[PDB]
Structure formats: structure tokens, C-alpha cells
Design a protein around this nucleic acid. Sequence first.
RNA 1: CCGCGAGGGGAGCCCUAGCACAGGUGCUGCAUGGCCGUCGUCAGCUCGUGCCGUGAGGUGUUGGGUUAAGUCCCGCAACGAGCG
Length: 225
Amino acid sequence: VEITVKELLEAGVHFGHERKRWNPKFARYIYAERNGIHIIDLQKTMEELERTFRFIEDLAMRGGTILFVGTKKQAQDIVRMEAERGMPYVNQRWLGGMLTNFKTISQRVHRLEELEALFASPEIEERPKKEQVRLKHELERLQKYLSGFRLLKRLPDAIFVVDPTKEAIAVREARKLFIPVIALADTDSDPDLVDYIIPGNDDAIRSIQLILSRAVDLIIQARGG
RNA sequence: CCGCGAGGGGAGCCCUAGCACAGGUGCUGCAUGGCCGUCGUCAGCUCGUGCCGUGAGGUGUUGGGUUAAGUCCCGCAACGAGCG
Ligand SMILES: [Mg+2]
Ligand SMILES: [Mg+2]
Ligand SMILES: [Mg+2]
Ligand SMILES: [Mg+2]
Ligand SMILES: [Mg+2]
Ligand SMILES: [Mg+2]
Ligand SMILES: [Mg+2]
Ligand SMILES: [Mg+2]
Ligand SMILES: [Mg+2]
Ligand SMILES: [Mg+2]
């Protein structure tokens, strides 16, 4: 399982953004501009996807956990399902602090582990029917935001983010903690902040869908089966 | 209590003299405790960690909707917690 220059075209991976939004630093990853939009050099994308996948692989081979990040409405369900098949992910909201204030965030994990505990329990039917609903609500939100974070029992060995310029909170945090950043990066982004880059469309389903799967494909390849 | 007894000593209480002292709704609420009136049963006041800033400090608590309500919802560098 590697990836064809062809398959990448079909994904529409090389379709960049308009020329308006644009990070000149990113120029080193561009073929040319057709009708307003920069077209990402796939001959490059491919040779970076290699250096990058080679990292992902050995990291996985050594047991590392990779935190997947996508807030964008396009990604969400792709990040989710892809992660699961076996890492943690963030796909609802990036709660500022999740990495650098990891402790007091994971505190919120034990809260829902403990509210999960309380709803399987008899002791719930005790509380007045008002706290009862107001406690189911507390639990509910926690599951929303944390259903993927709750797998992290310590900081990731690397984070893999979809769209670094959307996420550069998440990114900032990683770099401050010396965790390697991997990203699917479009032309709007500072590639200098990305330790392990994949330049290509950070926008279309058909694009992310391809990348994330082949990543994950590679992961459980090099986890023994 | 001592004595066979006359009786001496002693506890308690009393009076007189003298000494510690008691008594004072005399001052200072601008030396205070306690308690109370008040803004105000108004929805506010803050803290841990993270984050922003050289810094005082900010963030959170703000914004949009909702509520008797910092009541809840969505949002968001914030996630919570304490007094309310
Ligand atoms: Mg973008
Ligand atoms: Mg006798
Ligand atoms: Mg006698
Ligand atoms: Mg006196
Ligand atoms: Mg006074
Ligand atoms: Mg007076
Ligand atoms: Mg500082
Ligand atoms: Mg306030
Ligand atoms: Mg009230
Ligand atoms: Mg409250």
C-alpha cells in the first residue's frame, strides 16, 4: 500500500485555494496558477508524502499514539472514522489547553468516566429529577467534546492535523511541547510550522478521504496486521 | 479539735480600725469584639492551571440568543472551581 500520482489527481488533491488567501512561504510547493487558483505540484506532494509516511510508520511501529485533528465541517466524519480504525482524534472543538494544559483538561475525562459510572448505577434515581436531567446534560456535553480525547492517557507522540492554518492553536501547542506536527496543508499555510508535511487539498472530502485512509492504512499495516 | 474541768485553740459568719480592692450608663464606635443598617435578593465578586502581554493587567466573566438570575444555549484560548 503506497499511493499513485494518478489517484491523487482524482482526489483533486492539487486544487489549491484562490490566489487571494495565500502564503508565499508555500510557493515552494506550487506548479502554477490556472484561473485564479494555485495548483499544487504533485511531483512534490508525492515525495513529501513519502518522507512523511515513513515517519508515521516507524512511529506506529514503535507504539506511538498520533492525535488526529480536524475541526472543519468537511473533515469531521472523516477524521473520526479514520482515527477509530486505532488512535484518538479531536473533531468537535479544539479546547485550548488540551495539550499544554493537558492535566486540567483530562481532569474533565475522569468526570465523565464518573458520570458514566453514575448512570449505570442505582444511586442516580436518588437525585431530584432536576439535578438528574442537569447531570445528564453535563455528561452529554462531555461526550460530545471528549469522545476521542478520552483515549489519550498521556500527550501524543505526534499530532496529525487537517488544515494547519485553521488549527494553528492545536499546532502552536504541539510545537511548544516539542511534539511533532503532521498536516495536510493547502496554500494558505505556513509550511514552516509543519514538521512532517503533505501539501494538497485540505478542503474536499475526496482529498482528505484519500490521505487519511492511506495514513491509517499504513498505521495498522505496521502494527502487525 | 485538745481537756476530767475551769477553759485555750479553730471553721464559718458579724462589727470596728487599717490595706489590697470593689463600683462608675465618665470619655474615646476615629483604639476594638459581637451584632445590625446599607448599596442590594442587586447578580454580581473572585481563584487554580493554560494562554496573551516587557509590564500594571487581560483572558475565562466577553459576544449573539435566553433568563428573576454569571439561568441556560451557541460561540470562543480556554478548562474548571470557590463565594453568590
Ligand atoms: Mg483552509
Ligand atoms: Mg469531749
Ligand atoms: Mg464548751
Ligand atoms: Mg469598669
Ligand atoms: Mg464604625
Ligand atoms: Mg455617633
Ligand atoms: Mg510571560
Ligand atoms: Mg464581571
Ligand atoms: Mg435574584
Ligand atoms: Mg452560577
